[PDB]
Design a protein around this ligand. Structure first.
Ligand SMILES: Nc1ncnc2c1ncn2[C@@H]1O[C@H](COP(=O)(O)O)[C@@H](OP(=O)(O)O)[C@H]1O
Ligand SMILES: Nc1ncnc2c1ncn2[C@@H]1O[C@H](COP(=O)(O)O)[C@@H](OP(=O)(O)O)[C@H]1O
Ligand SMILES: Nc1ncnc2c1ncn2[C@@H]1O[C@H](COP(=O)(O)O)[C@@H](OP(=O)(O)O)[C@H]1O
Lengths: 247, 258, 258
C-alpha cells in the first residue's frame, strides 16, 4: 500500500479524448490513476520541485498495480520529451488523437466556455481562424493539430513503439476495441469487457459500468481546415506508419 | 410533402430484427418510415377509427417516396391479413425471420427485461420451457416461432411473391447483402451502400452510417441471451425440426436453422 | 510436469472436423493435446515400438491435466480397436461425424488439393463416383462414410456409452453446445464459454478466442467445395440413406443427414 512513480502517462493531444482514455483504463483493477492533471514536466514551478514532489501527487497503489497520470499539455511542449526520458527512457506512453479539424473546434469551444465562466471576453471562432482570406497561422489551436511536427519531439527521445497511438475518433464510436489494444500494449490482463461500456442517448457518448456504478460552422470554412491539414496528415501517416480516416 | 398510406409493411416476426430492418431500409432517400409501431390492424381501438386515422399516423413524405411501417404483432394476429388486403391487395409485405429457437430465447429475454425494469419477478427460461418433465406447448414464445402455421394465414390473401422474407440470421452477420434483396423487391434504386454499415465490437452488432453521423440500435436491441443446458436446446431444436421442414417447402427455400 | 499416456483419443472420422474438435477442446486449461496426428495404433512401424514410443510422442502435462491425441485414421482401421482396448478397456473415445455425403466431398477436396501441391493431376469427383451408371464401390472415400460398418468394429470392444459421438454438422453451425457436451462427457469443469467462439465472415467458419489471442484454423481447414451436379449429390444421399438408418439404430440416435 504505497505511492509509486507513473508506469505510464497519457501525453495528449489536448481535446483528443484523454479524460475518457484515462477513465476507461481506470476500470482495470490493476490500475491506479492520478485524479487530476499533474503538469509536472511542463511547468517550471512544478518541475523544479523534483521527482519527490511528483510522487507526492500520485495516488496510493498496490504492488501489483500500475500508476497512471494524465496531462494533455505534455504532447505540445518541446521541453517535456527529454525530461521524462531522463526519468525513465523505457517508460510507456499513451497518445490519443482525433481528426485535426474536429480537435481544433473542440479546443476553441473549450477556451470559449472557460472565458464565459468568468464574464471575460473571447472572439468568435471564425475570427481567430481567418486572416486576410487565409488561415491565421497565429492561432495556437491550429498548431496543436499539426501532429507530425509534435511527434518528432518525442521520436528524438522515444522509439515509435513505446508510444501507443489510440484512435480518438474510433474511441468515441467504438471504445472497447481501442481499450483492448491499450491493455495489450501495457501488458495487462484482459479484464475489461464490452459490457463495461454502454451508449447513452441523452449524453451522446459511451459511458461506463464498473461493479454496480453507472456513470458518464460554415461548411466552406470547415473545408479550408480539411485542405490545410491534408498535407500535414500525409506526413504524419508516414512518420508513424499507419493511416487514419481524417477528412 | 404529405401523409400517405404505406406501400410496404414490416409485419414481423416479433424479435426477428424488425427495428434493424426498419432503420436500414430508412437509409434510402426514397423511403419515409413511421418511427413507431402503429398497431392499426391488430387493435380494435385503432382499427375501428378507419383508414383515415391510420393515415395521420404516417410520417410526412414527398410524392416520390415509399412510406413504411412496422408492427411485429401483425404476423401472428389471425384477423390482420384480411384487413390489410381490404386496404390494398397489391401491397408488398416484408417479413424478417431468424432461427426459431434463437427467436424464442430472444422473446424470453425481452419479457424478462420488461419485468425487471418494473421491479416484477420472472422465472428462468427453463421453468417456462419445461414443466413436469415435458415441453410446455402453452408457452406463447413457442407458438410465435411456428412460422409455417402463421404463414398459411397470410397466403390466403397474398401471393407468396408479394411477401419478401428477410433472413434475420444473415442480417445479423452481414446486413448489406440482405438489404440489397429488399431494395430489388421494393423496386427501389440501389442507393444504400456497403459503406453505410460497420461492425461495432462494443455493441456486438453492425451499426449505421448516414450522412456523416453514426448510430447503433438502442440498448433494448441486442441483449444477451441466457445460458441454456444443451439438453434443453436439443429439445427445442427437435420441436421445430418438422415445422421448419414444412415452412421450407411452403415458401420454396431453405434457411440454415438448427 | 511429465508425459502421460492419453486419457482420451479422437479416433475419427477422417474429415469430420477432428482438427477443430481438438483445437476447441484445447481451450480448456485442464487439457494437454498432442499437436499432430500420432498414428500409433494403426501403423506397424509405430505400434511395434510399444507404449514407450507412444508416451514419447505425448506433450508435457500437469497432474491435474488430461492428455488427448488425434488420429482420424483410427476409426476406419479394423486392427485398431482391439489394440487400444488392450492398452485400456475403460478409456473414453471421441468420434466426430458429419453428413456422409459432405464427408465424401471433403475427402475428395483433400486428395485433390494434395495432388496439386505436387504438380500431380487428379480427375473431377464425378469421374471417381460414377461407374457404369451407379456409384463406384471401389472409391475408398465412399467406404469411409459407411459409419455403421466401422462402428461395429469399435462396439465389439467398447461400450456405446464410452464412445461419445460429436455432431460434425452442428459443430460447424454452432460449436459451443457440442463442446459443452464433450466437457461433460470427459468430466471436465465447464471452463469454456460461448465467448470463446466467434463467426468469421472472411473465413466461413467459427474461430477461437482464448486469453487475448484471436485465431482460425489453418488454410487447410475449410476448403472450397467442388460444385457438384445436383443429380449426383442426390445419388449420394440415396446411397447412404439405408446405411444411415442402420447407424441411427445401432447408436440409438438420429442425425439430420439428407
Ligand atoms: N466517452 C467519451 N465521453 C465524452 N467525450 C469523449 C469520449 N470519448 C472521447 N471523447 C472526446 O473527448 C473530448 C475531450 O478531450 P479531452 O478529454 O482530451 O480534453 C470530447 O470533445 P468535446 O470537448 O467536444 O466533448 C469528445 O469528443
Ligand atoms: N444491427 C443490429 N443491432 C442490433 N440488433 C440487431 C441488429 N440486426 C439484427 N438485430 C436483432 O434484432 C433483434 C430484435 O428484433 P426486434 O427489433 O424485431 O425486436 C435482436 O435480438 P436480441 O436483442 O435478442 O439479440 C438482434 O438479434
Ligand atoms: N471452425 C472450423 N473451421 C474450419 N473447418 C471446420 C471448422 N469446424 C469444422 N470444420 C470442418 O472440418 C473439416 C476438416 O476435418 P478434419 O480436421 O478432421 O480433416 C473441414 O472440411 P472442409 O475443409 O472440407 O470444409 C470443415 O468442414
Amino acid at each position: 500500500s504505497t505511492q509509486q512513480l507513473p508506469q505510464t502517462i497519457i501525453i495528449g493531444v489536448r481535446k483528443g479524448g484523454t479524460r475518457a482514455l484515462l477513465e476507461m483504463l481506470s476500470l482495470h483493477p490493476d490500475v491506479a490513476a492520478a485524479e487530476n492533471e499533474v503538469h509536472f514536466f511542463d511547468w517550471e514551478e512544478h518541475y523544479s520541485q523534483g521527482l519527490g514532489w511528483y510522487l507526492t501527487q500520485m495516488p496510493f497503489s498496490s504492488p501489483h498495480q500500475l500508476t497512471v497520470e494524465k496531462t494533455p499539455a505534455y504532447f505540445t511542449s518541446p521541453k517535456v520529451p527529454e525530461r521524462i526520458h531522463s526519468m525513465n527512457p523505457t517508460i510507456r506512453l499513451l497518445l490519443i488523437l482525433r481528426d485535426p479539424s474536429e480537435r481544433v473546434l473542440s479546443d476553441y469551444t473549450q477556451v470559449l466556455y472557460n472565458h464565459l465562466q468568468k464574464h471575460k471576453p473571447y472572439p468568435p471562432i471564425e475570427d481567430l481562424l481567418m486572416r486576410d482570406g487565409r488561415l491565421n497561422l497565429d492561432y495556437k489551436a491550429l498548431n496543436r493539430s499539426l501532429y507530425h511536427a509534435h511527434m518528432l519531439n518525442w521520436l528524438r527521445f522515444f522509439p515509435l513503439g513505446h508510444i501507443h497511438i489510440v484512435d480518438g475518433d474510433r474511441l468515441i464510436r467504438d471504445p472497447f476495441p481501442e481499450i483492448q489494444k491499450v491493455e495489450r500494449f501495457l501488458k495487462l490482463s484482459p479484464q475489461i469487457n464490452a459490457s463495461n461500456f454502454y451508449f447513452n442517448k441523452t449524453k451522446g457518448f459511451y459511458c461506463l459500468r464498473d461493479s454496480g456504478k453507472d456513470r458518464c460552422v460554415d461548411p466552406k470554412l470547415l473545408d479550408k481546415l480539411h485542405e490545410y491539414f491534408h498535407e500535414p496528415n500525409k506526413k504524419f501517416f508516414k512518420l508513424v506508419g499507419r493511416t487514419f480516416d481524417w477528412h
